[PDB]
């Protein structure tokens, strides 16, 4: 299942499937120019040519803990910090590190989330549905049924989340952290999308580190999706873990990410450039994006997940009467691509219909092509209303 | 034993337990000046900007392969090629492809070698001993004693070689191809420091590829040890499990070393700095640091292995009456550090007192700092002898 949809999310088409961030103009000037300043001084030699040189992983670490300590009033060091080759490699650590042979398992409290569709150790949580306005809908952790035991090893949350674009609510994460804390077990957020970078996050959320939650923040979605610069913030002794294993495993990060992070952070730009003007992009973007979808399909044909942050829309075409793997096929033979719900799903206890009445689309790409792609999905959502 | 040695090599030292190259003054310049022509046409930023830019993964899949194909008169196309973050990832891949749960082993035939260090799944066959000229002396396959059964995964060599230097022969790596054909499991050959790039070996070789071997290389040595560019060539079946797996723990390189790659594979500078400015480097320094070490030890206190081509010198203290990891905390104790040998043979079948009486050591530091280590190894070598 899986396999071919790599495949054919590889091999005119519209491809609405896929998980790169948009190529902001500002940024790009802005990343011409700090690439230029970094050749022009040696720094950009110094990343490549050295294998931890005067802003590699140690100059990064340190300036990662200031910016967390001045900015959040995080107590972190150094020694609470990882660096690794991005989001992906991260959690294999995590999971190989709390998770596996007892055997442990991944706790979802609240699925869908997008790690499980990436790679029996997955459990995952139905979650409540709250309906709301304009035909949109959030989803909700359902603490009366959620299980966590002995052999729950972690929990895991992404915020904002792929694929859904939702922000688990304040209460929700305290929550979790508590039951967490109480069965003594790591709460690992993914803040890919978040604050205080890359900032693409459109609802009210306060920010939480305790030692007992990891944290994987990533460069990628900065902008810069061609560096492999993952972080990752927990107690040291978890630190010290990750630091073995990417000592073996060897997926550390290449110099050139960190030498930019360092430098972004000197200039007081990280924040900066999130907060003014990724965020505003992406905000005006899937603002524009909704208003496409709704000239073509209402409430009644596709409820669309609230679009808390992140840089896709989340697509629930209510009581389809057919599958969307079999709208995707339809919508591929017409050269529109988008990703079928039911795999962002693994690890469910019960079957749920639901997850075959959702797709996943990127709402970056050029407008022209949204629309056009945007019409032909009405088109088949048409055409399975009137005949299967 | 292993954890110690990471913290000590990390934690005025003379630090020669290490395995970076050097910095080449010619390859620095070249280097600046590559990365001044990119950034100004919009290639370093493509390379960053993008996840698979104008000369991302797949501008460089076909590269090598023109590369391979019309140099060598190899038989590739970018089906045979596959990209990781490094040398280690690239292992770490074939490992499990190859070994693990039957259960099957990945048997060394001519230990000792790094990877088996770097990371009972390894078994180390003990080497025949040639004694050489100038104190020196080189390993040997032992085939009459070489044991490749049902259980045997996958055979891997690397040449040239980490820790030794070792160059296996023509003759040998003939019949070990031979009998991977045989027993149907892949010939795995680390050529991180081989032909056509870096080309840090002053050996004969010829090389070697066919459909059943398993070629890794890496741009690392070429003097770019932060960008993270692992390469693997092999039959397109592999390469298509590699594929899905590095899709999995996405341990793909970053843009900036394959950017780089395909800038010096298109100006054909690629195989003209390896073999008329890299390598001519590496002799002259290997023959240096010899001519250092012989004024301070004779045959008679230190045999080093034919340095046939990488950055190391492997030192053999023939009948040391102490081991070399209680040399290794005298050599500390005085702020000189090279790694204990015995860290190289894991999985032998029997104990060999030898793997106590070796160390590496890194040729590459300025000669001063050779000298002072040099200067103090022979003190404690004198000691060893004098007093225990
Ligand atoms: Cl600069
Ligand atoms: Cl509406
Ligand atoms: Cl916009
Ligand atoms: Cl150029
Ligand atoms: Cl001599
Ligand atoms: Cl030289």
Redesign the interface.
């Given at each position: 299942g899986i396999?071919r949809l790599?495949e054919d999310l590889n091999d005119g088409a519209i491809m609405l499937g896929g998980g790169?961030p948009a190529?902001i103009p500002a940024m790009?000037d802005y990343?011409?120019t700090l690439?230029?300043d970094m050749?022009?001084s040696?720094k950009?030699?110094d990343?490549?040519?050295?294998?931890d040189?005067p802003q590699?992983k140690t100059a990064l670490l340190n300036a990662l803990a200031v910016l967390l300590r001045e900015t959040l009033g995080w107590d972190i060091e150094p020694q609470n910090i990882a660096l690794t080759?991005?989001?992906?490699?991260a959690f294999?650590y995590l999971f190989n590190l709390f998770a596996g042979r007892s055997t442990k398992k991944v706790l979802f409290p609240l699925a869908p989330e997008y790690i499980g569709y990436?790679?029996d150790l997955f459990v995952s949580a139905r979650p409540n549905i709250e309906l709301l306005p304009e035909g949109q809908f959030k989803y909700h952790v359902d603490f009366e049924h959620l299980h966590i035991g002995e052999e729950t090893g972690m929990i895991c949350v992404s915020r904002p989340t792929n694929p859904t674009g939702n922000v688990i609510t304040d209460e929700e994460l305290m929550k979790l952290d508590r039951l967490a804390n109480q069965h003594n077990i790591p709460l690992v957020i993914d803040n890919a999308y978040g604050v205080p970078f890359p900032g693409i996050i459109f609802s009210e959320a306060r920010p939480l580190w305790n030692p007992n939650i990891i944290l994987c923040m990533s460069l990628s979605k900065l902008?810069?999706?061609?560096?492999?610069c993952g972080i990752i913030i927990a107690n040291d002794k978890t630190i010290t873990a990750i630091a073995?294993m990417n000592?073996?495993?060897?997926?550390?990060?290449?110099?050139?990410?960190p030498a930019?992070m360092c430098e972004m952070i000197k200039r007081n730009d990280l924040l900066r450039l999130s907060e003014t003007v990724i965020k505003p992009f992406y905000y005006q973007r899937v603002q524009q994006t909704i208003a496409i979808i709704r000239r073509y399909l209402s409430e009644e044909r596709c409820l669309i997940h609230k679009p808390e942050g992140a840089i896709f829309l989340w697509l629930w075409f209510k009581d389809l009467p057919i599958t969307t793997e079999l709208l995707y096929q339809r919508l591929k033979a017409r050269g529109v691509l988008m990703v079928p719900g039911h795999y962002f799903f693994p690890g469910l206890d019960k079957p749920w219909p639901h997850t075959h009445q959702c797709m996943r689309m990127n709402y970056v790409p050029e407008p022209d092509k949204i629309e056009a792609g945007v019409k032909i999905l009405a088109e088949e959502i048409e055409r399975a209303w009137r005949e299967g």
């Open positions: 396999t790599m790169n190529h790009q990343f011409q690439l230029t050749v022009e040696g950009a030699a990343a490549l040519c050295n294998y040189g590699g080759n991005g989001s992906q490699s294999f990436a790679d902008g810069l999706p061609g560096s492999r073995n000592g073996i495993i060897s997926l550390a990060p290449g110099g050139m990410g930019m």
